[PDB]
Symmetry: D2
Subunit: 484 residues, 4 copies
């Protein structure tokens, strides 16, 4: 299977012909040949986007909405193809990739729904005879740069909404998930969007991505990935004063208090901490439990972790966990386990690994110096920390450089609200999973987890600017020359 | 100042810089000594930052109405200090009585505006796509905010940033332009007398590349709001990335004033003189490139030059009717001389002006320019102004947009279709029909596009820059989860 | 034709069984048998909507949106049937019923798009430890009462938005357009909305309408019709403190200044004043022209009026004007012409009538005491008035009980804005027709023209309420007993 | 010496008719006051109509300046206002101090917000079309108020309606005319342009109905009894003017089994009996969970017993003052007698002397009791014991009213489920039923009225939206088709 770039309405090879073979994390079988594009390809996409910009931005919102409703209809027909690739390319289980595709349907529909309804403001003027209003205008060409864990839904949340308010897009997917990206471009092409409005360039982040980030004709970059990458991108973007949206790592706390249904809390914790092998930005990566239920919680949680079924995700619809995306991820998880053991952690269960598969390793007896307390653990290694009271719960929850999401389980309204208030995160959820996400809510973090919010109108805020415009209806006298 | 020394203001107290280092601030008007002021370093900036950080939670956590009360107290104090602010704006900044009067009136409105809005900054209650789910969005303050400002409108620019940032729960570390330190210290005087809690507002006087950079690179600083040169802005934005702090950047402008053929030409000339030369053209939103339709160009140019002839340049302390004061320093005079010399060298026609003496520089008006003139390619932060004659509205627009900047802009015309088409096509953050390019109100989104920066300031827009949205949910019913599937 | 009520999910005859025959305005021929329902039929519909309410109000908005998207799909299939009936029962020409059906599609889609995005507010509390927010709640059972001129679009605007946000509906169409009402019921039935959510009762206003207006379980009535009818409904509604939306008559001013393209201005005026025989709430009913262009304007206007083709609207697609809705309208226009001639008016053209057809009658030399200047002329009789300046234009424009829409033609920005500002109307359009309408803007008037606004989120404002809710997180001392 | 305030001038009514305002405390004469007729009201209405265009057309900042001036004068008049709220209205020091502090916040609030009421810029579905929505003031606004919180309620309607460019015709409750006069004094001293604000003192069915039926009045904002509200709404129809109606309430206070029972009793005493229970959002029906019901009733009655009833002028710690008039006492007596007769168990109180009524607390009541079926605008209170949360909600909702409501519980699930199911315009978890802030939407559903007041919600009531477009291209029209 050969995959291509999508530039100015045309599927085409990179200008060098350079290509790369992509393999499945599941068994190493070959999947496709994909472009290894370079700077010239990115520049061509940016140039196409730029030349398409004025026509795309200046048609009525309702027309852009019609293209998006069309893209929605095309997506609905391609659902099976997307699910297939999210599994074999990305390692996702059926339930995982099904969920991603449902959400992605909802995201495209949401962008379409909202395009006509993004409003500016009419202001009171402090001056006589003055009309004072504020228009919303699209930023221009927008770079879209994405990760590999939820490659479809993350890409589409950015792409659909950015397009909705009249920006054009240059899209560079994660090198482990280029085929998903190529399918998105297939969907867009079948939807018949004007040439240059959406462009796909497949290539290395440090080459194609950096060209996008540093190009003068790009107005904004919306980026999801590691904090370190985000910081580099932000620095590079400064040269042209382009704005950025950065959704970076998380190390979300899940806080379990002593008044919970302990069995339910364990079920919830298992799903939150380990869904998609814990490879989720808002995965519950640090579990924090009140000592009065800690023993029962830990037993029950481990009991349910043991029930998890790890297998070839292609095999059937009931597989719980698939493989990690590549061998480097397995190597890193081993470093995390090695660190925890060396610092006196107790390995209650798991740690076995074969190929790219990894059995969830669960630690207790951890302290704040463990790497799995200090770093984002983007994989199935999880600490459980026991605390004596709610002050400690909050202290532990905030003892991280990250600040994405978080959750508290309790039946007490005062403890729930106090903890929600006190925990330093961009998002918070009482009595639910840490990775709750809807299409039209402001999704994003604080501290090292990034800047900006995406989802519905918040995506619109990110890729538009306000424009104050006035009409003065009366002449007046001016202070200079005073001789007049 | 006859009874007090100029100092930093850190955690509730007026201190010396820790090195004791100082330097003499002199008047641009006559070189006379104004005061010794601090020359702080990274240590003093650090102490201010830590003070702001330690004050943060108590200041953010009180009810908004409490912060508004403090801003109302500040407003009352400002009204008492108005003459002192005007005096210093004139003698330290070189502004005329009418200029500094306007700045002080606007500053009063800015402080009041931030006080008015503090209680009313709202979040959102959302419809959940899920059953049994409450879904809402709170507004939270960003934290410690660095405020770094220029010398041209040092009071109103500083206070727009300071008053609004404080209103919504942030604490502040403020570093004024080195050419206007006494204005910053007077601001500190004002805050101190309003009795804000210690650490909530801090003033550090010292070099941008030292004190400023420390503010921009420090990890306990959440956001920087900055006004100044575009090159300085690019530098700050890149330094900002290291800690993922956000920035607000109000950078240069090269605003187009477009004059069409159906205008009252005399009114156009009067408007244009004011727009282009007020405060010696030292305004971010000064009308820096005048663009006139060929059908009225000859009479416009004659009229414009006629009124420019009347401009009275003098010592701004002399009386209330002085039109233009001096430029802020000698580097600026040297730079204007270059702009003038370049235009003449390139074949430009100097219609009037061109003399300078000390820090004083006369308006210098050119025609017969092309896009390669320095005064068409760069921001001319002084009284040197090109007039460009064009043949139609398309050329008006093409010329208007032929710039790296994109702050403001204006068109004069009585034709509704021409006005609206030109307003829509000009590439700027702000735009004004039948008014000056530097229109500004306390509560409107002020800011640019392209090289003129990012973000908006004024009223709720300032609040948008220095707060973040926080999505919170409550789920009222249990459910089953997909893993383990065996269950 | 098999026309019936639609109550609680079932098409059924009125309780008494009474029917009445609907004939065509075009030629008097039989069109269909329709119900003549009574109070019992209205009460049964109301009870059904009331019983259905909680289930409909409490599902997620996305679920209500789904039903509306389904309604949209059904409507798209019924287009030809709607155009047919609007022409044959309403007398609308092809181009008119086309426009109405195109706009109806947009109305339904608009209601669907917005359902999920109607937001409340999170407030700053002046108290410590207090959470303070505002929810949006549906008002409840909403009565929808509608007129004969744009029966489809006007009804669907009210019905679609009202349902979107969680109200249930009892709908009573105009007695002269009952088949359109029935076809609407068909669409909703086929869309599969839960029983009782939407209900159609075909009956006379003073019987079925008044029951709807006075019933205790109806929360709100949205009404469009004559100002006199509106005043009555508003008084009857007072008993049960139900709120109302009232879109009443208009007598909109079209103001033509001396700097215009006179030929264009004439073309615009003909369209705005006489489309659908001037039976439009926002018809340009009072034309006001500057003396410097009056003669040329009047000449050119009369010229294009004379070109208008009046005919059987069923014949072909290029018919300009069809019949008036009934004999009473013809009689009323004759009265209008009688009064005008009587007072010195100069009849420039038209006035001929046969059956329900009527040739547009255009008058000059009028003064403020003419009926055609004092009342809403819901038909093809139009005064042109000459004024000497802008002050006079505004004075004549505002010299009316009404205040719905209005328009000014000019290329001068100062004159356009000063006039826009000075004219007393709920709506105003610079360089366009008086009856400009979009699906998502606030549509409605001031003065005798009614109260409230409809369209998009403005319709939501009408049929929801704000609900302030707090949570206090700390205990405190109270002032009584003071001894405590 | 008390008079009307019409078009910048303090003047006697046309007919010269007056009447005597007496204190509810001891019947003492307070002042002679206008008894105005339809012509003093027509005069105020024409004054406001004629002042309107100048007032609405100045920039908002200038109206805000006038309100900040009003605030400065109000702060000077604080003591005067308290004194009159007490002697004329019957309020204790603590009640009137609260009302005055809140009123100050109300005037400041309207001033703060005047410059910031925004319209919208829209996306047009058409090409070459600018599409925006302006906010415009409705015009002359009638303000008609009740007697229980006459200052705060009046000023909430008046400050906000003024802020956004309406002019005002104000008729206060006949039982509290001096407070309305003091307001006119504050306004006169702030120097508002003549006719912008007008005070007419007189009878509701004369002065009030003229305001309500006058053609040049665009809006009436009303607070009072539901029946009066229905009458006003019907009359308003004839000129298609809009109305804001804040009517009675019968608010439920729901107390669940997991509470701090003592704290709940304290909160309940304050909520149910402050200002002698004469509050629209008073906790008028107390609903308590079986499991804590006995200890709650005991603790609640214990604290009610502690309430000090006395001349509110006597000192700052008096808990309760009198009812407003003799007729209120007689009504409460009917409420008490009906409950006794129906089998109710009177736990405490029920006595009355002069205009002072002793809080009467009942248990063992049913839904047929008058104090369960009607608004009890005084210190007579039923306690209903329930077995589960479903019963709590059923009892809470078994009323014609729907103003506010509250639940006390530490359980998040029960709190939210109950909050959602209670049919009320407002609701408070773990606080009193009558919580109120200056900038929040205050109002009810069902028989408690329509519309919301407070900050921008006040603005919404007394402004309309105006869609204005500019079309920048010409186009072809579909008639005549031959063209
Ligand atoms: C979130 O997301 C993270 C995981 O996703 P991830 O592994 O994809 O994060 P990542 O390494 O930061 O990469 C994210 C995206 O950025 C691209 N990228 C890498 N270097 C770049 C550069 N110098 N300029 C522009 N783009 C560049 C990547 O492309 P490549 O695939 O080519 O590296 C990828 O498309 C989690 O750790 C959590 O933090
Ligand atoms: C609320 O307020 C209620 C109690 O206060 P309240 O005794 O003052 O209620 P109220 O009797 O309804 O009176 C409210 C206001 O309306 C006036 N009014 C009475 N009839 C009127 C009419 N036909 N047209 C216009 N205005 C009229 C009253 O003036 P008068 O004082 O002259 O009657 C009074 O100022 C409680 O229900 C509480 O919940």
């Amino acid at each position: 299977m050969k995959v291509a770039n999508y530039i100015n309405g045309e599927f085409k090879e990179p200008s060098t012909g350079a290509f790369q073979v992509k393999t499945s994390p599941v068994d190493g079988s070959k999947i496709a040949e994909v472009p290894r594009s370079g700077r010239e390809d990115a520049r061509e996409a940016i140039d196409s986007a730029f030349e398409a910009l004025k026509a795309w931005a200046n048609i009525p919102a309702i027309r852009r909405a019609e293209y998006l409703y069309k893209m929605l209809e095309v997506f609905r027909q391609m659902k099976e193809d997307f699910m297939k690739i999210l599994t074999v390319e990305g390692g996702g289980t059926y339930r995982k990739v099904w969920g991603e595709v449902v959400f992605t349907e909802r995201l495209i529909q949401n962008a379409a729904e909202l395009a006509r309804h993004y409003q500016g403001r009419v202001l009171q003027s402090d001056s006589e005879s003055t009309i004072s209003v504020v228009f919303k205008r699209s930023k221009g060409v927008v770079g879209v740069i994405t990760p590999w864990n939820y490659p479809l839904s993350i890409s589409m949340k950015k792409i659909a909404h950015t397009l909705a308010v009249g920006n054009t897009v240059v899209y560079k997917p994660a090198s482990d998930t280029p085929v998903t990206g190529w399918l998105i471009a297939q969907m867009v092409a079948k939807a018949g969007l004007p040439k240059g409005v959406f462009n796909l360039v497949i290539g290395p982040g440090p080459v194609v991505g950096e060209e996008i980030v540093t190009h003068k004709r790009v107005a904004h970059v919306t980026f999801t990935g590691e904090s370190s990458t985000g910081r580099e991108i932000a620095a590079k973007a400064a040269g042209t004063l382009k704005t950025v949206t950065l959704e970076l790592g998380g190390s979300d706390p899940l806080i379990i208090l002593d008044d919970v249904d302990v069995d339910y809390a364990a079920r919830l914790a298992v799903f939150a901490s380990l869904f998609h092998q814990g490879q989720i930005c808002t995965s519950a990566k640090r579990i924090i439990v009140h000592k009065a239920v800690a023993d029962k919680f830990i037993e029950r949680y481990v009991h349910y972790v043991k029930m998890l079924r790890i297998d070839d995700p292609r095999k059937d619809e009931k597989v719980d966990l698939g493989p990690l995306i590549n061998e480097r991820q397995v190597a890193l998880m081993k470093e995390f386990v090695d660190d925890a053991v060396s610092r006196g952690g107790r390995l209650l269960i798991g740690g076995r690994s074969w190929g790219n598969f990894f059995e969830p390793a669960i630690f207790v007896d951890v302290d704040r110096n463990f790497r799995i307390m200090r770093e984002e653990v983007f994989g199935p290694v999880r600490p459980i920390v026991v605390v004596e009271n709610d002050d400690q719960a909050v202290e532990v929850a905030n003892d991280t450089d990250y600040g994405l999401s978080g959750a508290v389980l309790t039946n007490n309204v005062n403890r729930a609200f106090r903890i929600a208030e006190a925990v330093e995160s961009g998002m918070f959820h009482i009595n639910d999973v840490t990775f709750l996400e809807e299409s039209h809510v402001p999704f994003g973090g604080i501290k090292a987890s990034g800047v900006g919010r995406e989802g519905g109108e918040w995506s619109f805020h990110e890729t538009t600017y306000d424009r104050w415009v006035t009409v003065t209806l009366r002449t007046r006298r001016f202070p200079i020359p005073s001789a007049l």
